[PDB]
Structures are given as C-alpha cells and as structure tokens.
Amino acid sequence: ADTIVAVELTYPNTDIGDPSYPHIGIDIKSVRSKKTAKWNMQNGKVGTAHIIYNSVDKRLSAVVSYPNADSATVSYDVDLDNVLPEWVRVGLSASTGLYKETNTILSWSFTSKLKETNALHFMFNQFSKDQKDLILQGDATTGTDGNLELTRVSSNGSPQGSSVGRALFYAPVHIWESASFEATFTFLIKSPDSHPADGIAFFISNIDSSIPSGSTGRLLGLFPDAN
Amino acid sequence: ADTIVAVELDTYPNTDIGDPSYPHIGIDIKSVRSKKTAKWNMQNGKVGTAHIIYNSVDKRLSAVVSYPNADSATVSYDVDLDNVLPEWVRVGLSASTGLYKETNTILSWSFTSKLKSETNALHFMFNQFSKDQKDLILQGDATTGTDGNLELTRVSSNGSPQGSSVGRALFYAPVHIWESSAVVASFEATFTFLIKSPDSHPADGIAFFISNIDSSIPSGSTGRLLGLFPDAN
Ligand SMILES: Cn1cc(CO[C@H]2O[C@H](CO)[C@@H](O)[C@H](O)[C@@H]2O)nn1
Ligand SMILES: [Ca+2]
Numbered sequence: 001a002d003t004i005v006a007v008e009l010t011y012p013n014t015d016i017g018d019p020s021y022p023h024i025g026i027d028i029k030s031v032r033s034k035k036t037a038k039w040n041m042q043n044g045k046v047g048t049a050h051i052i053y054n055s056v057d058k059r060l061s062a063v064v065s066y067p068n069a070d071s072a073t074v075s076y077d078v079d080l081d082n083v084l085p086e087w088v089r090v091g092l093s094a095s096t097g098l099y100k101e102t103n104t105i106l107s108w109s110f111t112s113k114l115k116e117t118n119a120l121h122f123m124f125n126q127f128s129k130d131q132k133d134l135i136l137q138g139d140a141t142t143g144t145d146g147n148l149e150l151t152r153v154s155s156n157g158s159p160q161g162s163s164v165g166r167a168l169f170y171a172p173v174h175i176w177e178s179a180s181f182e183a184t185f186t187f188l189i190k191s192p193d194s195h196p197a198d199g200i201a202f203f204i205s206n207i208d209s210s211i212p213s214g215s216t217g218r219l220l221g222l223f224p225d226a227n
Numbered sequence: 228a229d230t231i232v233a234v235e236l237d238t239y240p241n242t243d244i245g246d247p248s249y250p251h252i253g254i255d256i257k258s259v260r261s262k263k264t265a266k267w268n269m270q271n272g273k274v275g276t277a278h279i280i281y282n283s284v285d286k287r288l289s290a291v292v293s294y295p296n297a298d299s300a301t302v303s304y305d306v307d308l309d310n311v312l313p314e315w316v317r318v319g320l321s322a323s324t325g326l327y328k329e330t331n332t333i334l335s336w337s338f339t340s341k342l343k344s345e346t347n348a349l350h351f352m353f354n355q356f357s358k359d360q361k362d363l364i365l366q367g368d369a370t371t372g373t374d375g376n377l378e379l380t381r382v383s384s385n386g387s388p389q390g391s392s393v394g395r396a397l398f399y400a401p402v403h404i405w406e407s408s409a410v411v412a413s414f415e416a417t418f419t420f421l422i423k424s425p426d427s428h429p430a431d432g433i434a435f436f437i438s439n440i441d442s443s444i445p446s447g448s449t450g451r452l453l454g455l456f457p458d459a460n
C-alpha cells in the first residue's frame with residue numbers, strides 16, 4: 001500500500017479513535033492521528049492552514065485559523081526520514097460520506113528545501129480548468145470560480161455525499177538524502193446541516209499514490225482502512 | 228514537429244546555415260537559424276553562467292552569458308510567446324556533439340515563472356544533481372549524478388566527450404506561460420556550465436529551451452541541430 005503522512009482537518013468517528021469534536025491532526029501511516037487538537041470550525045467562513053516541518057527539530061506542525069479567531073495548532077515529533085521514501089508527491093485530499101460539505105480550495109502554496117541547496121516552490125492563487133501541473137484524482141475538479149473542488153459539488157454549489165478527491169502536484173519532491181518544507185492552503189468548508197463531513201487534508205505520499213478503494217468518508221481519500 | 232523557443236550557446240560556427248564566423252549566443256524561435264546573435268568569447272575549460280529573462284511587459288527575451296573577469300555577451304529579441312508557444316510548456320536544457328565534441332556539463336540550474344492573471348508561480352533550484360533525479364525527464368545521452376552534475380551528452384569513462392551525441396533534461400512539471408487574458412509570465416532561467424574540449428575544436432553547444440509538453444529529441448538532431456530541431460530550415 002501507500003505510505004502516507006498527513007495533516008487532517010471535520011467529523012468525529014469515535015469508534016476509530018477520533019475525539020468527540022472537530023479535530024485537527026497529524027497522521028503517520030494511519031487515519032488514527034498520532035496527535036490532535038480541538039478545532040473550532042466555522043461553517044462557511046474562509047480558513048487558512050499552515051504546515052511546516054524542519055529537519056532540525058524533526059517536527060511537524062500545523063496551524064489552522066480564521067480571521068479574528070483563535071487558531072488551533074498541533075505538533076508532532078517524527079523523522080520523515082524513516083517514514084517516507086526519498087521522493088514523494090504532495091497533495092490535497094478531501095472526502096464526504098453520509099454527511100457532506102464543500103471542500104473548496106481557494107489557494108495552495110508549497111516550499112521544499114534540501115540543503116548546494118535544492119528547492120521547489122509553487123503558488124496557486126487561482127486554478128484553471130486545465131491545470132496541467134496538478135494531477136487530479138477521483139472527483140476533484142478545477143475551474144469553478146477558479147477554485148479547486150476536491151469533492152463533488154452541484155451546479156448551485158451544493159455538496160454531495162460519498163465523494164472523494166485529491167489533487168497532487170505534478171512534480172515529485174525530494175524530501176531526504178539520509179530537509180524542510182512549508183505548506184499553506186486556503187479553504188472553504190460549507191454545509192447545509194450543522195454536521196459537516198468529512199474533512200480536508202494535506203498529505204505527502206509515495207509518488208505513485210492514488211485514492212485507495214473505498215476511501216470515502218472517514219478514510220479521507222488517504223487510507224485503505226482504519227487501522 | 229515540436230514548437231521550440233530557445234537560447235543557444237553555440238561553440239561551432241556552421242556557416243552554411245547562418246552561424247556567424249565565430250562562437251556565439253543566439254535566440255531561436257522555431258528554427259535553428261537564430262533571429263539574433265551576439266559574439267561569444269567562449270573560454271574553454273572555464274565555468275560559465277547564462278541568464279535568461281523574459282518579461283510580459285516588454286515581451287522581450289534576453290540572455291547574458293559570462294565568466295569571471297571576462298566581459299559578458301548579451302542578446303535580446305522581441306517576441307510574443309503568447310503567439311508562438313502553446314499555453315503550457317516544459318522547460319529544459321539540451322546539448323549536442325557531432326564530428327567535433329565537448330563536454331556539456333551542467334553544474335546548476337534554476338527557473339522562475341510568474342503568472343499574474345494575482346500570481347501563480349513556479350520555482351526550482353538545482354544546485355546539485357542526484358543519480359536518480361525523479362523531477363527531471365532525461366532524454367538521449369543525458370545522465371545525472373556523476374559528480375553531482377548533469378551531463379547532457381555522452382562522456383567516456385575517463386572524462387572524455389563522445390561525438391555524435393545528444394541529450395536533454397526537462398523539468399517534470401508543465402509550466403503555464405500564458406493565459407490569454409494575461410500575457411505573462413514572466414520568467415527567468417539560470418544555469419551554470421562547463422564546456423571543455425581536449426580538441427582545439429569544440430562543438431556543438433548547449434541550449435535552454437521551452438517547448439510543447441510532449442517534446443522529444445527529434446531523430447537525428449545531433450551536431451548543428453543541438454537536439455532541438457529536426458532540420459535546418
Ligand atoms: C457510528 N456511525 C456510523 C456513521 C456512518 O457515517 C457515514 O458518514 C460519515 C460522515 O460522512 C463518515 O465518517 C462515515 O465514513 C460514513 O460514511 N456515522 N456514525
Ligand atoms: Ca473523522
């Protein structure tokens with residue numbers, strides 16, 4: 001199977017370890033986050049996510065926030081060095097199940113540095129209908145109002161259940177030789193209920209990664225099961 | 228045929244096809260016959276630096292080649308990439324040898340593109356090349372890793388260059404160079420190179436190029452063709 005490392009953001013699946021509230025988390029080869037923190041989600045408002053990892057501290061951190069609101073942050077010690085392969089791909093993933101929400105990405109940026117220093121950086125502030133430097137998987141689409149819609153949305157912007165989609169940057173990224181990065185994304189999660197599902201995530205995986213069979217809902221397009 | 232826009236650093240004068248009587252720098256728009264050239268005082272065995280810039284405002288392509296202490300050689304040309312190239316392209320480096328040869332070693336390479344349609348950007352920096360550089364598409368005789376360098380054309384087990392060779396390296400991801408409702412980018416490329424020919428006669432040159440995403444070495448583009456063009460039209 002695939003090797004995944006992710007920062008996840010919406011629906012509590014307590015039977016699989018989640019806490020009773022919306023949670024922010026760090027996933028290392030399992031959907032059962034190694035660490036989490038309370039995320040006071042705001043339906044229909046634009047959020048920001050910041051992820052950073054430095055090879056010095058060997059620590060992955062994430063912060064999510066809304067204008068004039070307190071942010072949530074989670075940190076976790078881990079040597080990517082021993083978890084992921086040398087080359088990887090970076091992407092955004094999201095899903096819905098019985099419940100849903102829009103999983104709109106308004107922007108996405110990324111920087112990798114491997115110190116003769118080698119680097120990669122990309123900035124997406126608008127998304128085009130034919131974004132060739134993105135690899136869309138599943139239900140993801142680009143174009144609508146220049147946004148990236150990870151899961152299925154209707155003509156009127158109404159979301160749909162049982163949907164899963166990812167978007168991976170076309171070029172592979174070198175993250176280790178024996179190595180820092182930063183990621184940022186702006187999102188819009190919106191639901192007509194008051195129990196959105198299932199969340200969004202930034203992830204790093206093997207270059208050939210793809211959505212696992214059946215990974216909608218709680219599995220967030222990332223994991224084949226819940227172990 | 229592929230669509231190419233390139234900046235060449237030509238060590239071999241091919242008089243019968245427009246090369247001036249000396250090593251030179253040139254800008255190539257869909258043909259190996261440069262729209263504009265400038266004399267280049269190539270210094271054999273010395274590390275050079277090439278800088279290529281393009282801005283949407285001027286819509287002017289420029290290039291400067293240099294070495295330490297010596298004076299630079301520069302060339303410019305006005306062109307609308309929105310008119311010449313497809314909207315998504317791939318960027319790369321290409322080189323070749325023919326009856327005469329030279330090493331075409333790349334020590335470093337970086338690229339930056341900006342598209343204010345506010346901006347979408349792409350930047351890459353290669354200060355060393357690994358033996359299995361997955362973010363690069365190698366074509367032809369091109370290899371990476373040896374000395375942490377990129378060798379565009381074939382080099383023998385003892386630091387010697389082979390003739391009739393050709394190779395290219397392309398960045399894996401496609402690059403958006405024009406939107407239509409946004410004439411940018413807006414790009415800049417830099418590479419560092421080492422061309423040495425144990426012969427008093429080096430050939431054929433190195434080039435930075437932009438092409439259709441599926442571009443590939445045209446069969447027979449050795450020598451004067453620099454790995455870019457299929458003929459000399
Ligand atoms: C005990 N229990 C069972 C369910 C069924 O939930 C569906 O809807 C959820 C939110 O869409 C998904 O997390 C889940 O994977 C599944 O698809 N909810 N609570
Ligand atoms: Ca959950």
Ligand SMILES: [Ca+2]
Pocket residue numbers: 237238239240241246431451
């Ligand atoms: Ca020539």
Ligand SMILES: [Mn+2]
Pocket residue numbers: 008018019023025031033
């Ligand atoms: Mn969770």
Ligand SMILES: [Mn+2]
Pocket residue numbers: 235237245246247253259261
């Ligand atoms: Mn020439």
